[PDB]
């Protein structure tokens with residue numbers, strides 16, 4: 062059945078037909094919704110998945126049922142038959158990667174989806190090769206602050222024993238250190254990964270903003286440490302346009318958000334190492350990297366310097382302090398000419414993108430729980446936008462952390 | 470379905486186990502392939518449909534009073550069954566009415582105030598016959614719940630539906646709301662959310678003061694008759710003028726709001742019985758007024774004027790001038806209510822209380838249905854503990870439900 066979605070602010074109604082093309086499950090049933098749950102091959106399984114993906118590719122280049130399509134179908138059938146897998150053409154790889162982003166229901170940045178620079182690293186064989194590919198990625202995507210979306214795609218899974226993995230959750234992150242006195246220096250979200258790197262030979266500078274090394278696994282082997290050359294790591298000292306004491310907080314962040322722990326699924330092939338990067342939405346740094354209790358947790362410090370009344374929560378001191386931190390982050394990246402988007406502009410673009418997708422595609426899977434920004438939700442247009450969430454493929458999926466599976 | 474479902478809190482690592490989802494009754498709107506969790510809304514029951522709905526409820530009530538399988542349990546079952554057999558319906562005992570109303574609140578997945586569910590004052594209005602009578606009951610409800618500012622949660626339950634042609638309805642969506650008037654030039658005076666209902670009231674004979682904060686009259690339908698207008702005595706309408714602890718100019722905005730949030734358009738379902746008029750009231754969370762009522766674009770939309778008086782740069786959105794004004798408006802609302810000693814709760818305290826409530830329900834009841842999309846407040850989402858809390862949503866009965874607007878279905882006499 063066709064499904065309508067209403068924006069209750071504009072009264073705009075869109076009609077979704079695209080959800081009819083999904084097959085993977087969402088985790089909900091008719092009786093229980095799991096919309097706020099973060100996480101709810103063989104030749105036999107492989108050809109239908111390959112067929113569907115090939116079908117939608119040639120349908121996208123408007124040569125469905127062509128001779129080129131027909132021959133690709135048999136080429137792929139014969140290759141699965143004789144090798145238990147197949148290899149994507151370069152055109153298919155690029156199309157698959159763009160559409161995995163296009164289909165990422167949790168991403169508010171998808172208006173850019175077709176401007177993805179795809180780096181084919183399927184010829185990689187060693188961790189040194191991975192490090193070279195990743196440095197080029199970082200260098201290209203950073204582009205001296207004029208950030209450019211990019212993905213680097215390492216070889217697909219074969220038997221599960223020869224996976225390529227970036228053990229880092231993101232290419233650039235700061236270290237976190239469990240202090241003797243109990244607390245945490247650095248980033249508390251990375252305390253475990255930081256200890257894995259120390260356990261592997263990394264000499265930690267035990268600072269507050271120590272860039273972690275890359276820990277890279279090629280073809281199932283033990284992972285190897287690499288230091289990203291610092292000139293490739295663009296950082297922004299966070300200052301504030303009005304509070305001149307803000308720079309004295311000593312804060313900074315990296316310019317390049319680059320997810321490296323996800324799995325890219327295209328035509329039944331699994332790319333366990335596909336680091337992808339874009340540019341930040343300000344709240345990603347300033348609401349949650351700095352103000353989550355289990356993160357940098359600086360709200361108290363900022364509210365202190367703002368001389369706010371912190372005895373009762375109903376003074377909203379946390380909310381004031383939160384806004385000022387996000388002002389500072391936006392102002393800092395913008396003053397350094399480093400690409401960043403505020404959550405008002407990003408959600409604006411997403412509503413526009415949604416309208417584009419409904420028009421040209423028949424829908425747009427979107428995860429309201431993730432799309433609505435972590436602050437000032439209802440003064441953004443997505444808060445009032447009904448969204449339908451469903452799973453389209455190609456897709457980015459979560460996978461287990463490598464240190465839970467790897468036989469050393 | 471699987472026997473146990475786990476939800477995680479991603480800030481605290483705490484994991485909870487839900488078994489209550491197995492008692493889920495009606496549907497969520499989601500399927501295996503599509504989730505409708507952000508969709509706002511995803512002729513009576515026959516004898517054969519009613520018997521099992523009644524038994525399910527009666528079993529649950531007697532299990533709650535630790536008398537399950539008792540003689541009075543079996544007797545009540547038999548008396549209900551005879552009643553449905555001969556009259557096609559049945560009447561709840563007062564104990565069961567009270568239990569069912571309290572549990573419809575306890576079960577309301579979209580409500581962050583549920584830690585209070587067991588303290589609901591239930592007013593039995595099932596002897597009402599006329600709209601004047603409904604007006605009396607509702608006035609008594611407002612006065613009791615307002616309590617000179619020390620608000621008390623309450624519900625007034627009018628007669629259940631019979632054949633559908635004799636419904637009791639409060640046509641108002643909430644007992645206390647401000648009028649909205651569309652001007653010929655396209656601007657709106659008052660509350661833009663309430664223009665449609667205001668126009669109905671004017672057609673029904675209301676003389677509008679045509680001001681910014683005019684309380685709407687009650688529009689009340691008894692036993693299926695045409696609805697009738699009543700002015701609530703203004704002394705029963707507690708109001709709070711909005712001022713700011715630092716910005717002396719904030720009171721010059723002439724803003725005020727009423728103290729009592731009182732929903733009057735929902736249907737209460739208990740044991741298959743349908744109470745189409747069941748106004749219920751609590752106290753406000755500050756953001757309901759300071760974010761949605763004042764700062765929604767299609768509402769009072771005062772962000773621009775507040776930012777102007779704060780002298781913020783309103784040309785770039787990256788100045789976050791909207792967010793900065795939103796916080797001060799919410800500071801003023803919380804500070805005005807506390808100064809006048811009217812009960813209100815900020816979103817930090819309400820969400821902490823809800824997490825505590827949810828953990829106890831998981832422990833004592835086996836689960837707590839919650840709609841994250843509605844539970845997380847409309848500002849400062851992730852600095853509240855509910856943001857990081859996974860929640861399972863499902864529909865238990867007794868429950869509060871939406872129902873069509875009465876002007877869409879009423880057969881005019």
Ligand code: HEM
Pocket residue numbers: 158161162165167168169170171173177210211212337338339340341342345402407431457
């Ligand atoms: C171009 C600028 C981009 C912006 C502003 C942006 C914005 C965002 C934000 C704010 C989130 C939620 C982040 C979180 O809270 O964890 C997100 C999620 C996501 N983005 Fe985008 N993104 C961008 C680029 C990309 C690219 C280039 C890809 C892939 C090629 C991508 C794929 C995803 C995926 C898969 C998620 C979901 C991750 C998860 O499930 O944890 N995004 N995006």
Ligand code: HEM
Pocket residue numbers: 570573574577579580581582583585589622623624749750751752753754757814819843869
């Ligand atoms: C006592 C203090 C209470 C507080 C602080 C409170 C808080 C809230 C809030 C903030 C919402 C979301 C409102 C919105 O955004 O429209 C809500 C929804 C709801 N509340 Fe509570 N509430 C309270 C009392 C009650 C009572 C007494 C009942 C019923 C007996 C109730 C039943 C509901 C229901 C059914 C909803 C869903 C409304 C809808 O879907 O439109 N609440 N509540």
Ligand SMILES: Cc1cc(N)nc(CCc2cc(F)cc(CC[C@H]3CCCN3)c2)c1
Pocket residue numbers: 231317318319320337338339340341342344345346349350
């Ligand atoms: C390509 C991309 C761009 C972007 N802009 N975002 C993401 C989402 C993943 C991500 C990467 C980061 F490098 C930082 C964050 C911040 C998330 C918030 C919530 C918890 C910690 N901060 C998210 C991906």
Ligand SMILES: Cc1cc(N)nc(CCc2cc(F)cc(CC[C@H]3CCCN3)c2)c1
Pocket residue numbers: 643729730731732749750751752753754757758761762
């Ligand atoms: C019993 C109760 C208490 C409370 N505290 N809340 C509600 C929710 C229903 C409601 C009634 C109102 F009178 C005002 C609001 C504000 C909610 C948002 C949506 C529309 C504008 N504000 C909500 C009910």
Ligand SMILES: C[C@H](O)[C@H](O)[C@H]1CNc2nc(N)[nH]c(=O)c2N1
Pocket residue numbers: 069444445446447448507508509842843844
């Ligand atoms: C589209 C979306 O479902 C809609 O805007 C919802 C979002 N969450 C909400 N949450 C609450 N508490 N109240 C609301 O009215 C809404 N509106």
Ligand SMILES: C[C@H](O)[C@H](O)[C@H]1CNc2nc(N)[nH]c(=O)c2N1
Pocket residue numbers: 096097098099430431432433435479856857858859860
């Ligand atoms: C419990 C809940 O699913 C979890 O906290 C989600 C909520 N919404 C989110 N939204 C974004 N953008 N990012 C997140 O990490 C989360 N976390």
Ligand SMILES: [Zn+2]
Pocket residue numbers: 089093094095096499503504505506
């Ligand atoms: Zn769902």
